[model samples]
Target: SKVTTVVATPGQGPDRPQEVSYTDTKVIGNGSFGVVYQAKLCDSGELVAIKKVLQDKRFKNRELQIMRKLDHCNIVRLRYFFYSSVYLNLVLDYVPETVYRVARHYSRAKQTLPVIYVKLYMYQLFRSLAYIHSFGICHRDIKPQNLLLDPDTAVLKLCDFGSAKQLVRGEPNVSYICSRYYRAPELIFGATDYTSSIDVWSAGCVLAELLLGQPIFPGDSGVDQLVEIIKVLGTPTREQIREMNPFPQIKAHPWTKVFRPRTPPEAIALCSRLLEYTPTARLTPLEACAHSFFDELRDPNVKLPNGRDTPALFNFTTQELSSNPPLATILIPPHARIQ
Candidate 1:
């Protein structure tokens, strides 16, 4: 019933403050990080999610800092931000659903997610990761819950930068980070010098969960979590253990046996590359994007399950390809390239 207006700063570019108006505010999400409200912008009638968090005057807000630097199709866009007394508010793109909810919906119906969706969502996720990791940002949290989806378009966007950080080489970082289910083994082992590869591990967990319809490693506790991983992957080798600040064994369970027989072999192959015990051994996000598991996404004629054209998949910028030039030819299909 009320339209609120504020002099807010644009999330990117020069900070010339402008008045922004919005209404239809309602609480959509809340947690220890703060509260997220769904609101409609009065000017464009576009929906937005406002994340309000208590501002600690002592230090700069890392989440805001990291978010302002990010601009990618698969990553949520920060539209504007403002401060109210001791609270910092971030206005972000409001996507309607989450991958978590989508997965659960299928699980509840006793149905598996159509393989096309798993490919589309995970491929977009890899693109987002590739973009951020290129800038040295590590999204410590990468669970399905943080992945926002547009149900109709089937486009996925990475959200919740509250646990994101820009890792500096040789600097010590807290070992305790990321959600329990998706935490990298290196983090669980108390390694302080972990790299962006940790995010790759979390992404791997997300992929496995989608395919299995439940968390692949649902541990009751920290120690139990490691035990759960061991049950499947068998054990970390002595060399692998040392790399993580790091493990035990039974013979390794074959990857083929880990998933249902109908699961595509390429998907399992991709999982092995992303979930490696050694951090460096894991596929870099860009490399993961180039994996054969996503080849279906690269097909020119692929469409959404509803028959809509798939969301822009291969519009890679030159910067995104700078890390590996040869991969460019493989990443953008011939049809997707310019004349």
Candidate 2:
């Protein structure tokens, strides 16, 4: 099947979505961007999710330009998109969804999810993350809501790239991106020299939470988030962790704190790298792939809707030294760059 592609106007960006025709009947999800709907190409029955973001004066052109380059098995393919003077229509892969409006409603008293359910979901999403990073994209946002699983196929799609960024070795990246919960400690503490490990850290938190059935560190603010993370992983004593300086957005505290101290050993061991106070100590997607927690399930061939198989699966092994992505710099927002 021929894949759909997005066409951008000459020097267009986030503030303006390409004006294109789309069925705007069914809404999938909505956010500060705009509304997402289930739609199809007027000519082709090819299904896609159309996100119509409110028109912005300075759009996410830099961000979208980078996102468009993402083409991988784990990465959800961008179908077609256009920006009108009014709104940006982002046409992307459509996945059936299941969400608990109030997760607490489903929790069993202590706010825990079923272990079996969490395990299956953990494996599916982890593979997807590992797959995306291999293509040089950091999802930036890896949380329960972003993990879109297809019940029929058990194939999980990592949806939402409104905040994703690409990084190179030694390149300085931007902080203050992604959701507060998934944001790395470096981000909370204002570190610009962070890397894809930020996403890996979130993956670790998501995985451990899936096992424990709750938020590992539910910090109210940046400080609270960091404090919660340190509380669980033990405070970084300025040793055993290095390479960050003048961390911002946090106030010096009197005593070290480790949140979720009551969590199980396996859970803490897994979340340690993710929740580590420093970016260097966090696990990368590649390392998480090898973690014993996932040892029980080995990588298996997965086919897309079509019979084609994505080679990213188990492809990282070049028969040489395989390692997770190295520490990277943060990405600057397109808006910020303009200024």
Candidate 3:
């Protein structure tokens, strides 16, 4: 019955501040960063998320800065931001479900996610990563929970940038980022100078989780995380741990054994490249998008399990493809090509 109004500026537009009004506020999430509330715009009746956090005097909000620079289908859109002397707030598009919840539903029922859903979600995640990493930004946190989903459309949007950073080559970042189960080997090893490839590793964890109906590297701590990884990939000397080759020395763990029966070899193959112990050894986000695992998604006739048309999997921007131009052919099907 109550309404809140604030004067805010557009997330990605000319600086023209205006008044925005919303109502029906309810808490959706809460943590040290702040509380996130779900509300609806009075004029449009559209739902949105209002995340409020303390404004530290010493440091500006890096999440706001990085999020403002992002524009992609697979990433959450920032609609507006409001800052008071003591608190900062971000208004974001509201997506009702997370991959975490969706996966848990299947997990609870003791069923693996339909392989098509995994392909669709992971493919979009790779696209988001490619877009952000091309700008030198690292999400730092990549896990199932951060992936927002629209159940009907089956679209996944990566969210939660509180831990994200625009990783610089010579700069050092704190090792205490990302969730334990999804943390990359380098992060667990306390590597301060890590790359966006950490995200790729986390993504691999998510894929494996979806395939297994549970977290693959279910570690309780940093050390245990590496232990879990070693059990599968075997220990790599720190020096041997950072580069990923489509073809490599010592064959990769058999995906056939890692996944359940009926899982596609292409899916297993892609996950192998992603969860490689070496940081650079993991596929780049864009490279993952081009992997044969997602080839089925590129098919003109592949519909979603719900019988609805698949999401726009091939609509890529020039900037997203700039990282590896050659991948364009593999990512976009000839039948779907606009030009």
Candidate 4:
């Protein structure tokens, strides 16, 4: 394998550009944004994904700006970044699989994703959401495809910050953001001044998809997106419509019936709180984490299906707990707490 070295700066902390070397570079994925290459660090032999995107000389990259400020276990870590003549390369922790791929694997096998795995994945999603929302950073894209998963540890890390922004009040943002299936009702209604709750709605859709074995709102078009939502959630009340930008009394289909017969009631209840018609009505990310649906994850004895210990679920920092001190106690289990 050929080694490539560059004078790159660390993604976080003080910037001190130094020579970094990596090898075994191979293209893993690509899209409209740019190309992603998988490589290995020469010093540690650790694998990394280098996202190379075109840089507009006139403006700073929002993805790089936001990614530099983030430091959470459930969110992908930015290792280093460098600039080429016309492109910017972001080196990030290489997580092997995505939630979309894992779910599809089970779907093709014609089996429901184990509820325990759902709990682990969704709980981490909410935790990541909580951390970002606390900083007022809205990850406009929160679909399953953006969630990186390590199958061995069952650790889920939120990735793809290309659409993320630190939303300020009274500032107008583009409405057409986030993937269609996970798009919040406000976004579908063309609400530009939306909140981080949009991410919560997307998280809800992800949860529902895992439970149902497919997307709950599989809209064929922009308008049809609402039609898909209306089918299950029925019609939004007039006040609900006002809240979103802001629909009917078609009567919401029962959440229980929306999933398989054995779906946990707590899971269904959490979904209801997240997929609310009104933005504020949706549970905050920390609140969602504190919900009883994730209580099992806090158990000290809980382990992955492979008999390995579960990922670090309760290792929260002071900044994260500062969002809601009351919830912090509930979020961390007694045994998991540091002395």
TM-scores vs. true structure, each candidate:
0.97, 0.68, 0.94, 0.97
Winner by TM-score between candidate 2 and candidate 1: 1
User: By TM-score, is 2 or 3 better?
Assistant: 3
Model 1 segments more than 4 A misplaced: none
lDDT of 4 by residue, 15-74 (tens): 898899999989999968999999999999899999999899798898998999998999
Lowest lDDT 10-mer window, candidate 4?
246-255
Clash statistics: count for each candidate: 0, 26, 6, 3
Question: Per-residue lDDT for 51 in model 1?
Answer: 96
- Per TM-score, what order, best first? 1, 4, 3, 2
Clashing pairs in 3: 241-278, 242-279, 242-280, 243-281, 244-280, 244-281
lDDT of 2 by residue, 1-339 (tens): 333344544222334534344443577677776787887655656677777876666655545575566554444666555765467766777777532222445655666554434444555566666656666677777777777655555455677787877777788777778776777666776777777777777777776566555676787787877666665555566753455454232443322133244544544456555656666766666555555554323324334334544222233332111243331111111222343
How far out, in Å, is residue 35 in model 2? 2.7
Q: How many backbone clashes does candidate 1 have?
A: 0
Q: Give the per-residue lDDT digits (tens) of candidate 1, residues 84-117.
A: 9699999999999999999999988888898999
> Candidate 4 has what TM-score?
0.97
Q: RMSDs, each prediction?
A: 1.2, 10.3, 3.2, 1.4
- Candidate 3 per-residue lDDT, tens place, 1-339, comes to 898899997887788998999999999889777899999999999999989999887987898888888878899999899886488889998999999999998899998888889899999999999999989999988998899999999999999999888888989889889987988877777788888999999999999999989899887776666666767786675466544211223443556877788888888888888987677668899999998888888888899878899988888889999899998878889988755
